[PDB]
mmCIF file of C-alpha atoms and ligand atoms in Angstrom:
data_model
loop_
_atom_site.group_PDB
_atom_site.id
_atom_site.type_symbol
_atom_site.label_atom_id
_atom_site.label_comp_id
_atom_site.label_asym_id
_atom_site.label_seq_id
_atom_site.Cartn_x
_atom_site.Cartn_y
_atom_site.Cartn_z
ATOM 1 C CA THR A 1 75.794 51.193 145.943
ATOM 2 C CA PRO A 2 79.288 52.315 147.397
ATOM 3 C CA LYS A 3 79.534 55.854 146.051
ATOM 4 C CA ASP A 4 83.241 55.874 145.237
ATOM 5 C CA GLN A 5 82.655 52.947 142.837
ATOM 6 C CA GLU A 6 80.458 55.333 140.800
ATOM 7 C CA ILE A 7 83.242 57.812 139.883
ATOM 8 C CA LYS A 8 84.601 55.620 137.097
ATOM 9 C CA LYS A 9 81.001 55.002 135.813
ATOM 10 C CA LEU A 10 80.212 58.652 135.829
ATOM 11 C CA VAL A 11 83.306 59.592 133.941
ATOM 12 C CA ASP A 12 82.730 56.933 131.388
ATOM 13 C CA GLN A 13 79.142 58.119 130.811
ATOM 14 C CA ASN A 14 80.011 61.783 130.413
ATOM 15 C CA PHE A 15 83.518 62.010 129.067
ATOM 16 C CA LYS A 16 84.123 58.760 127.061
ATOM 17 C CA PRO A 17 81.405 59.525 124.415
ATOM 18 C CA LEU A 18 83.301 62.612 123.418
ATOM 19 C CA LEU A 19 86.200 60.554 121.979
ATOM 20 C CA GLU A 20 83.967 59.116 119.243
ATOM 21 C CA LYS A 21 81.975 62.447 118.865
ATOM 22 C CA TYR A 22 85.024 64.429 118.084
ATOM 23 C CA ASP A 23 87.362 61.717 116.808
ATOM 24 C CA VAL A 24 89.772 62.370 119.738
ATOM 25 C CA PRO A 25 92.731 59.841 119.948
ATOM 26 C CA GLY A 26 93.425 59.991 123.670
ATOM 27 C CA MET A 27 92.067 61.517 126.796
ATOM 28 C CA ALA A 28 92.879 61.589 130.504
ATOM 29 C CA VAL A 29 90.289 62.504 133.015
ATOM 30 C CA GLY A 30 91.033 62.770 136.742
ATOM 31 C CA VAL A 31 88.853 63.429 139.746
ATOM 32 C CA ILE A 32 90.151 64.212 143.275
ATOM 33 C CA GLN A 33 87.726 63.831 146.059
ATOM 34 C CA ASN A 34 88.616 63.952 149.796
ATOM 35 C CA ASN A 35 92.239 63.747 148.908
ATOM 36 C CA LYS A 36 91.739 60.448 146.963
ATOM 37 C CA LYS A 37 92.924 60.603 143.322
ATOM 38 C CA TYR A 38 90.880 58.774 140.574
ATOM 39 C CA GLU A 39 92.465 58.566 137.096
ATOM 40 C CA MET A 40 90.646 57.532 133.936
ATOM 41 C CA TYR A 41 92.663 56.971 130.762
ATOM 42 C CA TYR A 42 91.234 56.440 127.224
ATOM 43 C CA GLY A 43 92.788 55.954 123.828
ATOM 44 C CA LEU A 44 96.194 56.628 122.528
ATOM 45 C CA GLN A 45 98.841 59.225 123.244
ATOM 46 C CA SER A 46 100.204 58.488 119.658
ATOM 47 C CA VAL A 47 98.108 57.088 116.893
ATOM 48 C CA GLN A 48 101.100 56.150 114.682
ATOM 49 C CA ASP A 49 102.811 54.497 117.559
ATOM 50 C CA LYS A 50 99.725 52.727 118.945
ATOM 51 C CA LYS A 51 100.900 54.056 122.360
ATOM 52 C CA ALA A 52 98.395 54.105 125.140
ATOM 53 C CA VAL A 53 97.463 57.069 127.323
ATOM 54 C CA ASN A 54 98.576 56.506 130.923
ATOM 55 C CA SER A 55 99.811 58.208 133.978
ATOM 56 C CA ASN A 56 103.209 59.068 132.200
ATOM 57 C CA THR A 57 101.445 60.796 129.293
ATOM 58 C CA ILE A 58 102.531 64.487 128.877
ATOM 59 C CA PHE A 59 99.887 66.834 127.430
ATOM 60 C CA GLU A 60 100.105 70.413 126.459
ATOM 61 C CA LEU A 61 97.996 72.639 128.807
ATOM 62 C CA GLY A 62 97.502 75.582 126.533
ATOM 63 C CA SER A 63 96.031 78.479 128.532
ATOM 64 C CA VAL A 64 95.895 76.459 131.733
ATOM 65 C CA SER A 65 99.546 77.395 131.722
ATOM 66 C CA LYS A 66 98.461 80.893 132.913
ATOM 67 C CA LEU A 67 97.526 79.295 136.324
ATOM 68 C CA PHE A 68 101.213 78.549 136.878
ATOM 69 C CA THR A 69 102.170 82.051 135.795
ATOM 70 C CA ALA A 70 99.662 83.361 138.216
ATOM 71 C CA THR A 71 100.991 81.131 141.146
ATOM 72 C CA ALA A 72 104.538 82.274 140.159
ATOM 73 C CA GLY A 73 103.332 85.875 140.462
ATOM 74 C CA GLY A 74 101.742 85.128 143.879
ATOM 75 C CA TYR A 75 104.938 83.556 145.100
ATOM 76 C CA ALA A 76 107.116 86.413 144.032
ATOM 77 C CA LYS A 77 104.629 88.887 145.710
ATOM 78 C CA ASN A 78 104.871 86.902 149.021
ATOM 79 C CA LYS A 79 108.694 86.931 148.777
ATOM 80 C CA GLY A 80 108.447 90.715 148.426
ATOM 81 C CA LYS A 81 110.149 90.552 145.021
ATOM 82 C CA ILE A 82 107.143 92.426 143.434
ATOM 83 C CA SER A 83 104.127 94.428 144.346
ATOM 84 C CA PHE A 84 101.048 94.167 142.213
ATOM 85 C CA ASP A 85 100.950 97.979 142.242
ATOM 86 C CA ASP A 86 104.399 98.145 140.546
ATOM 87 C CA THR A 87 104.674 98.793 136.814
ATOM 88 C CA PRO A 88 106.612 96.724 134.209
ATOM 89 C CA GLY A 89 109.332 99.387 133.753
ATOM 90 C CA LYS A 90 110.437 98.908 137.411
ATOM 91 C CA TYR A 91 111.764 95.515 136.212
ATOM 92 C CA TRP A 92 112.221 95.632 132.448
ATOM 93 C CA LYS A 93 114.165 98.940 132.387
ATOM 94 C CA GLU A 94 113.752 99.521 128.623
ATOM 95 C CA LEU A 95 110.008 99.983 129.316
ATOM 96 C CA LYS A 96 110.504 102.725 131.957
ATOM 97 C CA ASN A 97 108.591 105.939 131.338
ATOM 98 C CA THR A 98 106.940 104.444 128.186
ATOM 99 C CA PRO A 99 103.087 104.373 127.931
ATOM 100 C CA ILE A 100 102.851 100.671 128.968
ATOM 101 C CA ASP A 101 104.706 101.682 132.235
ATOM 102 C CA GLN A 102 101.438 103.287 133.304
ATOM 103 C CA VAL A 103 99.738 99.869 133.575
ATOM 104 C CA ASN A 104 100.428 97.981 136.792
ATOM 105 C CA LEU A 105 101.242 94.295 137.179
ATOM 106 C CA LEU A 106 97.819 93.228 138.470
ATOM 107 C CA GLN A 107 96.252 94.904 135.534
ATOM 108 C CA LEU A 108 98.632 92.994 133.131
ATOM 109 C CA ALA A 109 97.827 89.730 134.923
ATOM 110 C CA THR A 110 94.118 90.219 134.609
ATOM 111 C CA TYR A 111 93.871 91.663 131.060
ATOM 112 C CA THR A 112 92.859 95.275 131.750
ATOM 113 C CA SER A 113 95.509 97.324 130.073
ATOM 114 C CA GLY A 114 92.928 98.643 127.689
ATOM 115 C CA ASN A 115 94.675 97.861 124.458
ATOM 116 C CA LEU A 116 95.976 94.264 124.234
ATOM 117 C CA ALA A 117 94.281 91.587 122.167
ATOM 118 C CA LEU A 118 94.339 87.777 122.353
ATOM 119 C CA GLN A 119 97.545 87.172 120.359
ATOM 120 C CA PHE A 120 100.602 89.182 119.505
ATOM 121 C CA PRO A 121 100.854 90.007 115.759
ATOM 122 C CA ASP A 122 102.199 87.192 113.559
ATOM 123 C CA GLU A 123 105.253 89.234 112.724
ATOM 124 C CA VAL A 124 106.289 89.630 116.371
ATOM 125 C CA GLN A 125 108.641 86.661 116.985
ATOM 126 C CA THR A 126 112.075 87.773 118.308
ATOM 127 C CA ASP A 127 112.891 89.148 121.700
ATOM 128 C CA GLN A 128 113.708 92.453 120.037
ATOM 129 C CA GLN A 129 110.421 92.465 118.213
ATOM 130 C CA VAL A 130 108.630 91.736 121.612
ATOM 131 C CA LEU A 131 110.445 94.723 123.242
ATOM 132 C CA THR A 132 109.621 96.971 120.287
ATOM 133 C CA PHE A 133 106.024 95.932 120.498
ATOM 134 C CA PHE A 134 105.700 97.066 124.127
ATOM 135 C CA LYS A 135 107.741 100.245 123.657
ATOM 136 C CA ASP A 136 105.472 101.267 120.771
ATOM 137 C CA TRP A 137 102.408 100.427 122.858
ATOM 138 C CA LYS A 138 99.831 103.254 123.409
ATOM 139 C CA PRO A 139 96.649 103.071 125.405
ATOM 140 C CA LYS A 140 93.069 102.789 123.965
ATOM 141 C CA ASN A 141 90.438 102.100 126.588
ATOM 142 C CA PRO A 142 90.947 103.727 130.032
ATOM 143 C CA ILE A 143 93.646 101.637 131.883
ATOM 144 C CA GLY A 144 91.976 99.273 134.326
ATOM 145 C CA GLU A 145 88.354 99.514 133.026
ATOM 146 C CA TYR A 146 88.093 96.959 130.175
ATOM 147 C CA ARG A 147 88.922 93.252 130.203
ATOM 148 C CA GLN A 148 90.256 91.800 126.981
ATOM 149 C CA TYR A 149 91.554 88.358 127.418
ATOM 150 C CA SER A 150 95.079 88.429 126.141
ATOM 151 C CA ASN A 151 98.349 86.429 125.808
ATOM 152 C CA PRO A 152 100.624 89.397 125.416
ATOM 153 C CA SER A 153 99.133 90.839 128.677
ATOM 154 C CA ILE A 154 99.779 88.036 131.077
ATOM 155 C CA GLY A 155 102.932 87.131 129.065
ATOM 156 C CA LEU A 156 104.422 90.459 129.999
ATOM 157 C CA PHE A 157 103.352 89.873 133.679
ATOM 158 C CA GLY A 158 105.135 86.491 133.527
ATOM 159 C CA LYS A 159 108.351 88.066 132.019
ATOM 160 C CA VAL A 160 108.273 90.682 134.801
ATOM 161 C CA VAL A 161 107.801 88.073 137.554
ATOM 162 C CA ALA A 162 110.905 86.222 136.116
ATOM 163 C CA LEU A 163 112.905 89.429 136.071
ATOM 164 C CA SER A 164 112.012 89.951 139.709
ATOM 165 C CA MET A 165 113.318 86.558 140.606
ATOM 166 C CA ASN A 166 116.487 87.064 138.441
ATOM 167 C CA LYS A 167 115.904 83.804 136.483
ATOM 168 C CA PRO A 168 114.375 83.080 133.121
ATOM 169 C CA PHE A 169 110.670 82.249 133.360
ATOM 170 C CA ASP A 170 111.175 78.601 132.373
ATOM 171 C CA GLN A 171 113.552 78.124 135.315
ATOM 172 C CA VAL A 172 111.241 79.943 137.641
ATOM 173 C CA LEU A 173 108.670 77.272 136.948
ATOM 174 C CA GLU A 174 110.970 74.203 136.610
ATOM 175 C CA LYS A 175 113.298 74.991 139.459
ATOM 176 C CA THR A 176 110.999 76.791 141.993
ATOM 177 C CA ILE A 177 107.326 76.523 141.417
ATOM 178 C CA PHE A 178 106.858 73.061 140.160
ATOM 179 C CA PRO A 179 109.058 71.490 142.885
ATOM 180 C CA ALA A 180 107.258 73.471 145.577
ATOM 181 C CA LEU A 181 104.037 72.042 144.202
ATOM 182 C CA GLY A 182 105.398 68.462 144.295
ATOM 183 C CA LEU A 183 104.936 67.974 140.556
ATOM 184 C CA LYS A 184 107.159 65.328 139.085
ATOM 185 C CA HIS A 185 106.676 65.514 135.304
ATOM 186 C CA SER A 186 105.633 69.206 134.547
ATOM 187 C CA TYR A 187 107.671 71.184 132.016
ATOM 188 C CA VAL A 188 108.091 74.333 130.025
ATOM 189 C CA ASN A 189 110.647 72.399 127.888
ATOM 190 C CA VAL A 190 110.140 68.743 127.752
ATOM 191 C CA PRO A 191 113.546 67.000 128.134
ATOM 192 C CA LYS A 192 114.938 64.459 125.811
ATOM 193 C CA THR A 193 114.405 61.698 128.364
ATOM 194 C CA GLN A 194 110.640 62.385 128.414
ATOM 195 C CA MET A 195 109.980 62.886 124.659
ATOM 196 C CA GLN A 196 108.790 59.273 124.429
ATOM 197 C CA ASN A 197 106.061 60.247 126.915
ATOM 198 C CA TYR A 198 105.061 63.444 125.190
ATOM 199 C CA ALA A 199 101.681 62.851 123.300
ATOM 200 C CA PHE A 200 101.130 63.972 119.830
ATOM 201 C CA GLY A 201 98.414 66.562 119.540
ATOM 202 C CA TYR A 202 96.027 66.204 116.628
ATOM 203 C CA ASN A 203 94.623 69.031 114.572
ATOM 204 C CA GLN A 204 91.175 69.303 112.862
ATOM 205 C CA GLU A 205 92.494 67.285 109.942
ATOM 206 C CA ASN A 206 93.764 64.620 112.433
ATOM 207 C CA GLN A 207 97.474 65.360 111.640
ATOM 208 C CA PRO A 208 99.785 64.986 114.514
ATOM 209 C CA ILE A 209 101.302 68.186 115.785
ATOM 210 C CA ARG A 210 102.836 69.950 118.795
ATOM 211 C CA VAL A 211 102.904 73.458 119.956
ATOM 212 C CA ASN A 212 105.165 75.831 118.007
ATOM 213 C CA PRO A 213 107.601 78.428 119.592
ATOM 214 C CA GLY A 214 106.140 81.899 119.862
ATOM 215 C CA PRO A 215 106.574 85.213 121.717
ATOM 216 C CA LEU A 216 106.262 84.982 125.514
ATOM 217 C CA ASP A 217 104.703 81.578 124.821
ATOM 218 C CA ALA A 218 105.731 79.902 128.111
ATOM 219 C CA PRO A 219 103.787 82.133 130.617
ATOM 220 C CA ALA A 220 100.628 82.268 128.250
ATOM 221 C CA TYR A 221 100.285 78.734 126.998
ATOM 222 C CA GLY A 222 103.511 76.765 127.177
ATOM 223 C CA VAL A 223 103.390 74.292 130.085
ATOM 224 C CA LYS A 224 103.083 70.524 129.579
ATOM 225 C CA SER A 225 102.090 68.125 132.311
ATOM 226 C CA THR A 226 100.650 64.677 133.210
ATOM 227 C CA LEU A 227 97.263 63.782 134.788
ATOM 228 C CA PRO A 228 98.824 62.804 138.116
ATOM 229 C CA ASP A 229 100.666 66.191 138.322
ATOM 230 C CA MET A 230 97.574 68.185 137.424
ATOM 231 C CA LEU A 231 95.612 66.292 140.157
ATOM 232 C CA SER A 232 98.265 67.230 142.621
ATOM 233 C CA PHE A 233 97.994 70.868 141.419
ATOM 234 C CA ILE A 234 94.300 70.784 142.038
ATOM 235 C CA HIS A 235 95.017 69.141 145.442
ATOM 236 C CA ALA A 236 97.314 72.136 146.371
ATOM 237 C CA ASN A 237 94.492 74.497 145.349
ATOM 238 C CA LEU A 238 92.015 72.563 147.453
ATOM 239 C CA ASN A 239 94.227 72.397 150.490
ATOM 240 C CA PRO A 240 97.112 75.004 150.398
ATOM 241 C CA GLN A 241 97.637 74.706 154.196
ATOM 242 C CA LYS A 242 99.531 71.360 153.649
ATOM 243 C CA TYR A 243 102.113 72.906 151.393
ATOM 244 C CA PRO A 244 105.237 75.046 152.277
ATOM 245 C CA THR A 245 104.077 78.324 153.562
ATOM 246 C CA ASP A 246 105.515 80.368 150.692
ATOM 247 C CA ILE A 247 103.619 78.361 147.975
ATOM 248 C CA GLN A 248 100.602 78.344 150.224
ATOM 249 C CA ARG A 249 100.542 82.188 150.105
ATOM 250 C CA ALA A 250 101.024 82.001 146.447
ATOM 251 C CA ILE A 251 98.030 79.719 145.904
ATOM 252 C CA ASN A 252 95.698 81.982 148.146
ATOM 253 C CA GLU A 253 96.777 84.949 146.097
ATOM 254 C CA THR A 254 95.493 83.253 142.895
ATOM 255 C CA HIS A 255 92.109 82.659 144.554
ATOM 256 C CA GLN A 256 91.398 86.334 145.356
ATOM 257 C CA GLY A 257 88.746 87.724 143.016
ATOM 258 C CA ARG A 258 89.859 91.164 141.644
ATOM 259 C CA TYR A 259 86.861 92.311 139.635
ATOM 260 C CA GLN A 260 83.827 91.018 137.949
ATOM 261 C CA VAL A 261 82.234 90.723 134.493
ATOM 262 C CA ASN A 262 78.644 89.900 135.425
ATOM 263 C CA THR A 263 78.619 86.340 136.949
ATOM 264 C CA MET A 264 82.396 85.729 136.282
ATOM 265 C CA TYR A 265 84.862 86.909 138.876
ATOM 266 C CA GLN A 266 88.418 87.307 137.495
ATOM 267 C CA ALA A 267 90.993 85.908 139.947
ATOM 268 C CA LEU A 268 94.745 85.624 139.182
ATOM 269 C CA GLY A 269 94.630 83.083 136.341
ATOM 270 C CA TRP A 270 91.614 81.343 137.721
ATOM 271 C CA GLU A 271 88.164 82.264 136.798
ATOM 272 C CA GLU A 272 85.900 82.261 139.900
ATOM 273 C CA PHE A 273 82.125 81.773 140.432
ATOM 274 C CA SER A 274 79.548 81.611 143.093
ATOM 275 C CA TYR A 275 78.912 78.023 144.080
ATOM 276 C CA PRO A 276 76.697 76.289 143.060
ATOM 277 C CA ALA A 277 76.962 77.866 139.649
ATOM 278 C CA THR A 278 74.372 77.218 136.910
ATOM 279 C CA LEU A 279 75.612 75.404 133.887
ATOM 280 C CA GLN A 280 75.071 78.488 131.739
ATOM 281 C CA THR A 281 77.173 80.648 134.153
ATOM 282 C CA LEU A 282 80.092 78.269 133.551
ATOM 283 C CA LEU A 283 79.490 78.134 129.743
ATOM 284 C CA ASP A 284 79.223 81.965 129.625
ATOM 285 C CA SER A 285 82.888 82.344 130.796
ATOM 286 C CA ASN A 286 83.900 80.719 127.582
ATOM 287 C CA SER A 287 81.564 82.653 125.281
ATOM 288 C CA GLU A 288 82.797 84.620 122.247
ATOM 289 C CA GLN A 289 81.770 87.895 124.144
ATOM 290 C CA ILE A 290 83.896 87.088 127.162
ATOM 291 C CA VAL A 291 86.908 85.362 125.391
ATOM 292 C CA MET A 292 87.221 87.432 122.227
ATOM 293 C CA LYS A 293 85.809 90.921 122.941
ATOM 294 C CA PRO A 294 86.499 93.790 125.285
ATOM 295 C CA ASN A 295 84.135 94.068 128.309
ATOM 296 C CA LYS A 296 83.944 96.845 130.791
ATOM 297 C CA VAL A 297 84.500 95.530 134.225
ATOM 298 C CA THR A 298 82.905 96.347 137.594
ATOM 299 C CA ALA A 299 84.044 96.091 141.159
ATOM 300 C CA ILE A 300 82.972 92.998 142.980
ATOM 301 C CA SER A 301 79.652 93.602 144.601
ATOM 302 C CA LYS A 302 78.505 90.289 145.693
ATOM 303 C CA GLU A 303 81.480 88.597 147.411
ATOM 304 C CA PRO A 304 80.673 84.876 146.955
ATOM 305 C CA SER A 305 80.388 82.965 150.295
ATOM 306 C CA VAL A 306 81.252 79.604 148.642
ATOM 307 C CA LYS A 307 83.384 79.820 145.529
ATOM 308 C CA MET A 308 84.310 77.474 142.657
ATOM 309 C CA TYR A 309 87.128 77.999 140.147
ATOM 310 C CA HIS A 310 87.882 76.841 136.604
ATOM 311 C CA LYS A 311 90.006 77.304 133.530
ATOM 312 C CA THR A 312 89.915 76.086 130.022
ATOM 313 C CA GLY A 313 93.113 75.730 127.855
ATOM 314 C CA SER A 314 93.875 74.831 124.263
ATOM 315 C CA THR A 315 96.756 74.526 121.934
ATOM 316 C CA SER A 316 96.254 73.676 118.209
ATOM 317 C CA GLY A 317 96.496 69.976 119.070
ATOM 318 C CA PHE A 318 95.306 69.779 122.745
ATOM 319 C CA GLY A 319 92.380 70.581 125.046
ATOM 320 C CA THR A 320 92.417 71.056 128.843
ATOM 321 C CA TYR A 321 89.911 71.835 131.438
ATOM 322 C CA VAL A 322 90.410 72.120 135.297
ATOM 323 C CA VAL A 323 87.837 72.835 137.923
ATOM 324 C CA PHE A 324 87.682 72.674 141.672
ATOM 325 C CA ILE A 325 85.289 73.445 144.522
ATOM 326 C CA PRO A 326 87.081 73.977 147.932
ATOM 327 C CA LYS A 327 83.985 73.444 150.311
ATOM 328 C CA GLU A 328 83.184 70.279 148.450
ATOM 329 C CA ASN A 329 86.771 69.172 148.547
ATOM 330 C CA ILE A 330 86.444 68.061 144.920
ATOM 331 C CA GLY A 331 87.981 68.863 141.517
ATOM 332 C CA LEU A 332 88.369 67.578 138.099
ATOM 333 C CA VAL A 333 90.988 67.603 135.302
ATOM 334 C CA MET A 334 90.479 66.729 131.697
ATOM 335 C CA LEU A 335 93.292 66.439 129.157
ATOM 336 C CA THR A 336 92.749 65.565 125.502
ATOM 337 C CA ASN A 337 95.205 65.401 122.535
ATOM 338 C CA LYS A 338 92.616 66.903 120.170
ATOM 339 C CA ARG A 339 90.627 70.032 120.886
ATOM 340 C CA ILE A 340 86.940 69.673 121.653
ATOM 341 C CA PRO A 341 84.472 72.445 122.162
ATOM 342 C CA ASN A 342 84.901 74.233 125.506
ATOM 343 C CA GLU A 343 81.233 73.816 126.258
ATOM 344 C CA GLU A 344 81.591 70.008 125.995
ATOM 345 C CA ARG A 345 84.384 70.016 128.558
ATOM 346 C CA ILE A 346 82.501 72.244 130.929
ATOM 347 C CA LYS A 347 79.233 70.364 130.600
ATOM 348 C CA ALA A 348 80.726 66.970 131.116
ATOM 349 C CA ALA A 349 82.654 68.143 134.250
ATOM 350 C CA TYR A 350 79.450 69.763 135.586
ATOM 351 C CA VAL A 351 77.447 66.465 135.263
ATOM 352 C CA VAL A 352 80.240 64.500 136.978
ATOM 353 C CA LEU A 353 80.916 66.852 139.801
ATOM 354 C CA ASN A 354 77.216 67.266 140.544
ATOM 355 C CA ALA A 355 76.519 63.558 140.637
ATOM 356 C CA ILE A 356 79.310 62.870 143.033
ATOM 357 C CA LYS A 357 78.039 65.884 145.121
HETATM 358 B B1 LIG B 401 94.034 79.814 125.883
HETATM 359 O O1 LIG B 401 93.810 78.444 125.685
HETATM 360 O O2 LIG B 401 92.843 80.355 126.288
HETATM 361 C C1 LIG B 401 94.659 80.434 124.652
HETATM 362 C C2 LIG B 401 93.596 81.182 123.753
HETATM 363 N N1 LIG B 401 92.757 80.154 123.105
HETATM 364 C C3 LIG B 401 91.398 79.963 123.355
HETATM 365 C C4 LIG B 401 91.041 78.888 122.597
HETATM 366 C C5 LIG B 401 89.706 78.311 122.534
HETATM 367 O O3 LIG B 401 88.623 78.981 122.912
HETATM 368 O O4 LIG B 401 89.518 77.091 121.897
HETATM 369 N N2 LIG B 401 92.112 78.354 121.863
HETATM 370 N N3 LIG B 401 93.134 79.209 122.234
HETATM 371 N N4 LIG B 401 95.410 79.606 123.832
HETATM 372 C C6 LIG B 401 96.444 79.834 122.922
HETATM 373 O O5 LIG B 401 96.761 80.913 122.720
HETATM 374 C C7 LIG B 401 97.285 78.766 122.306
HETATM 375 S S1 LIG B 401 98.347 79.586 121.181
HETATM 376 C C8 LIG B 401 98.932 78.151 120.268
HETATM 377 N N5 LIG B 401 98.460 76.925 120.340
HETATM 378 N N6 LIG B 401 99.142 76.031 119.411
HETATM 379 C C9 LIG B 401 100.136 76.671 118.817
HETATM 380 N N7 LIG B 401 101.060 75.947 117.780
HETATM 381 S S2 LIG B 401 100.279 78.408 119.064
#
């Protein structure tokens, strides 16, 4: 049996059943193998409109947006606009000589400030309130020693990256990073002319919704993209030597592991693992303990010879999973317009990628 003919069958067997299981209106699953793209579309981007999911459908990426923030940081570092040893007050002058100005940019990007939780407080909304939050910040855990997964943390990193490139963060992605990556329909702000392609998300009561504005939302969870674009992004991560040298350096930078929390290596944005990874290793990265709680980190001891990378992302109405394995030249993207459990996304991708080899 010609093996490429099995990719569609494998994705049908492992991803399609999730639509009925979780009452998901629409899903887009892509595989890239040996530079060939496979795109599988299911269901509806809009229930009320009876509009089909296809290659023009725009989905919210949720925390997979952090991978573009990381790539923007790697790009600015290669242009010499920042050093990861700098502190945020070098760029956001109102933070200079405040306690947060003891945390360096790598520590912000990789969640080890020692006192930043997953979300800003609900009452922090305006730019002024965001600044006040960081000026009022005081340490808790020893800086650099504890990982607590955090939108404020990588959000501040993103704001600093934009300051170093003298452009607002949305313009850094839309005018510099996305074009260098060859993405055609990736947005921080979806323009009027693409709104008809923007899927509705659906909440747990199946009501149609889209992501709401929030503080430093764009660098933490505010990018929207299509399946073809996300496959191109995976392609760039699988083969950065084909891309312009500056974006090539940026991508490499996001692949470097910085520290570990047992079997999970924290890279810039990406989570990294020894390949082959056990299923439970991949599931653990999304455990309550790793996602919601502080964990003391360690230095990398085992430097994986062959690596794989992944990232989950969610908004209230959307689920995302991306995973790639350089030495197998394969990767996978899943986009849904209703959240489904992280472990389902990870497991389905594991079965598919293992069966293709
Ligand atoms: B990110 O996706 O990791 C991040 C945090 N997170 C984790 C999960 C999970 O485990 O299901 N869900 N969220 N995502 C966000 O912070 C999204 S914030 C918002 N999403 N929709 C809004 N209207 S605000």
